[PDB]
């Protein structure tokens, strides 16, 4: 066939042309770190957390946006790859606020877990952090944008999945802020999903605010009945009480999204 051969840490794998370095590592069970890449949105390549060394190449490549060339040996655990993940994680946490105890994302946060799996264990940052002013985008999504890492997943989702071009980046540089610029409400039938695709606690559920923590919930896999689509959901419960509703991936029904009524 047209399949080309690439190596992931020396293991051969046959991938279709156009496949990305990140997708080639999935074929062998390896998951590359990521904050901006989502398998159902456009490729951004702006978090630089997926940098992976390619053998016999002096430069690291964005694994989420780099197509695989034939005969490449992707080194997912070399010193260069691991030193690229520590630097990027160090830059993500430089201005991030010490909000973990009061942040609803604590315990199920990709920034926490990838900081403890791919980053360093301390900080050499001896300055003052940045502070951003919060924004109101409706009664459903609570915004604390000091925690935003400018991953643009909410921008791509709102424009592509929801077909609403209301979110964007204003300013430039370290002062780049995600928002609607003007006082506007991102009220859409798929508006609640920006909570999930936000890796940090910048976007969180307002009804669910402060009620529970991820580890103490019990997950019941059920079906949504608010409409005839039959969206698959997870009913999170704690001590005999329903706490929140979450999407459950089903490729042929609802992807990994659910409408606001369901959520």
């Amino acid at each position: 066939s047209n399949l080309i051969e690439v190596f992931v840490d020396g293991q051969s794998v046959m991938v279709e042309p156009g496949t990305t370095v990140l997708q080639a590592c999935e074929k062998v069970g390896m998951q590359i770190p990521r904050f901006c890449y989502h398998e159902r949105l456009s490729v951004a390549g702006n978090c630089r957390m997926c940098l992976v060394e390619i053998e016999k190449a002096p430069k690291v490549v964005a694994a989420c946006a780099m197509p695989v060339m034939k005969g490449w040996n992707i080194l997912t655990n070399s010193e260069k790859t691991k030193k690229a993940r520590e630097g990027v994680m160090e830059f993500l946490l430089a201005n991030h606020p010490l909000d973990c105890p009061i942040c609803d994302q604590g315990g199920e946060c990709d920034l926490q877990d990838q900081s403890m799996m791919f980053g360093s264990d301390r900080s050499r940052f001896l300055e003052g952090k940045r502070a951003v002013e919060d924004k109101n985008i409706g009664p459903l999504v609570k915004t604390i944008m000091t925690r935003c890492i400018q991953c643009t997943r909410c921008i791509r989702f709102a424009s592509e999945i929801a077909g609403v071009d209301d979110l964007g980046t204003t300013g430039r540089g370290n002062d780049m802020q995600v928002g609607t610029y003007i006082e506007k409400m991102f009220m859409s039938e798929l508006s609640g999903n920006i909570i999930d695709i936000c890796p940090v606690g910048a976007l969180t559920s307002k009804p669910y605010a402060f009620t529970a923590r991820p580890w103490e919930t019990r997950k019941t896999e059920s079906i949504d009945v608010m409409d005839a689509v039959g969206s698959n959901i997870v009913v999170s419960t704690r001590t005999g009480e329903v706490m929140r509703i979450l999407p459950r991936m089903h490729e042929d029904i609802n992807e990994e999204w659910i409408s606001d009524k369901t959520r």
């Binding site: 606020p97 010490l98 909000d99 009061i102 952090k129 940045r130 502070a131 002013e133 919060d134 000091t146």
Partner: protein, 96 residues
């Protein structure tokens, strides 16, 4: 402060009070219901709003390592005060 429902049972700071028909009130017969009278919501509101001449101010809660993690608060918004998410202290920008 501490309120009292019509039955005379003191309402806690969490809004808890047994209804008239609730049998669980019997546990207080011959004893007392322990209610803390120093409502935090009331006390924190008594603190004055501090004026600071900068866009961004930081709060560690007072005492350094005896306080809370140091967070940074934005004061650009002129229609409200900036509030610390740990201790509740409020800050404002000097004449903007």
């Amino acid at each position: 402060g501490v309120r009292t429902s019509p039955t005379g049972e003191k309402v806690t700071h969490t809004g808890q009070v047994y209804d008239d028909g609730d049998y669980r009130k019997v546990r207080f017969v011959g004893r007392q219901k322990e209610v803390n009278e120093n409502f935090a919501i009331d006390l924190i509101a008594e603190q004055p709003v501090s004026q600071v001449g900068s866009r961004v101010i930081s709060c560690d809660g007072g005492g350094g390592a005896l306080g809370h993690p140091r967070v940074y608060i934005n004061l650009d918004k002129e229609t409200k005060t900036g509030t610390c998410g740990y201790c509740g202290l409020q800050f404002r920008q000097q004449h903007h």
